[PDB]
Amino acid sequence: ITGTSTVGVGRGVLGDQKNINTTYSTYYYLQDNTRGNGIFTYDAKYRTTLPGSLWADADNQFFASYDAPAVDAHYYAGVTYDYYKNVHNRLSYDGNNAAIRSSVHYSQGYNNAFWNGSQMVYGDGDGQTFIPLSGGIDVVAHELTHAVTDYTAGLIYQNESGAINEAISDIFGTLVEFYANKNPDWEIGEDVYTPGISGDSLRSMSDPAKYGDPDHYSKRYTGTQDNGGVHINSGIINKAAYLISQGGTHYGVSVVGIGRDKLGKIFYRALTQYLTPTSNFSQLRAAAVQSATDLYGSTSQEVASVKQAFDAVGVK
Numbered sequence: 001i002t003g004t005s006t007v008g009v010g011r012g013v014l015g016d017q018k019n020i021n022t023t024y025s026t027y028y029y030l031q032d033n034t035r036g037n038g039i040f041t042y043d044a045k046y047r048t049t050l051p052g053s054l055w056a057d058a059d060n061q062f063f064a065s066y067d068a069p070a071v072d073a074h075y076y077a078g079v080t081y082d083y084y085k086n087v088h089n090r091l092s093y094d095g096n097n098a099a100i101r102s103s104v105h106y107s108q109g110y111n112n113a114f115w116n117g118s119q120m121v122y123g124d125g126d127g128q129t130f131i132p133l134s135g136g137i138d139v140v141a142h143e144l145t146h147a148v149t150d151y152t153a154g155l156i157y158q159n160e161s162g163a164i165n166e167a168i169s170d171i172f173g174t175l176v177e178f179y180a181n182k183n184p185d186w187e188i189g190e191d192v193y194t195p196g197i198s199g200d201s202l203r204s205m206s207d208p209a210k211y212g213d214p215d216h217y218s219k220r221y222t223g224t225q226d227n228g229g230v231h232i233n234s235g236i237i238n239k240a241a242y243l244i245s246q247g248g249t250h251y252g253v254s255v256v257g258i259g260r261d262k263l264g265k266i267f268y269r270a271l272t273q274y275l276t277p278t279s280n281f282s283q284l285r286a287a288a289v290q291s292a293t294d295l296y297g298s299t300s301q302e303v304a305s306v307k308q309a310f311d312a313v314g315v316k
Ligand SMILES: CC(C)C[C@H](NP(=O)(O)CNC(=O)OCc1ccccc1)C(=O)NCC(C)(C)C
Pocket: 111, 112, 113, 114, 115, 116, 117, 133, 138, 139, 142, 143, 146, 157, 188, 189, 202, 231
């Protein structure tokens, strides 16, 4: 909407206070004009028709319980935008400052979040499996990264390409979490998963097997559930990414860690210059090796570490 840029204040899902960029025109809207062509957050009002209504508030204060998922979707979309712009020189998900749209309060008891081809969508959770999913910065960045993937590599959402698609979202979700630097880890969704259980998460990149996800190609799922295991086989690539960044010895194969920033550069380059819609795990290895070669040189530690990590997870 047309209005003047303002700054509201509210509390997120976890009870933390934050400032948010809003727009004033009669109401204060969750419309952040400071980033690209805007970040826009909508109320789906417990229904499934999208996007719903652009979030309107009378006083620019967002401290109601109902406000919390909107505050976080809006704010964490901003952080994710900043990460891509500042770290990778990418302007929004399409590289041309596309408006970023999110809807919260989607459906009832909805234990998921997704990119629907055009926008991000967040359930509130059922209060047991999840609390409102926009409360996780890794979750928000995971969803926005699906848009990035769709505009770039275009990885088809099934089988190996789909597992790469998933891992890319977990990898950048985690890198954005580190970028924001509030309780960062290599776990996925820990801030919004199972409020009654401390210390767990939806997935682990450092040890995917802790939740039964494969950490080696020999343990890949080959059935038809979950689009051929896109959220399962992602563990193999998540583990490789974790090893590239942090190092470790995995099934007897030692990897020298090169750090998060280089992991991010290598995978961002792979995603945007080498991966295609049908890339499989072997092709991702090749893409990552080539990306590291481009950035650091064929004889570099970075290249050696990428090879070590894929060796460790059984991807040749
Ligand atoms: C980061 C977590 C919190 C959310 C994450 N959601 P996602 O974006 O991967 C769900 N993806 C999904 O719904 O794709 C299917 C799809 C395809 C085209 C248009 C709309 C929807 C996830 O891992 N979902 C899978 C669960 C088993 C955890 C629910």
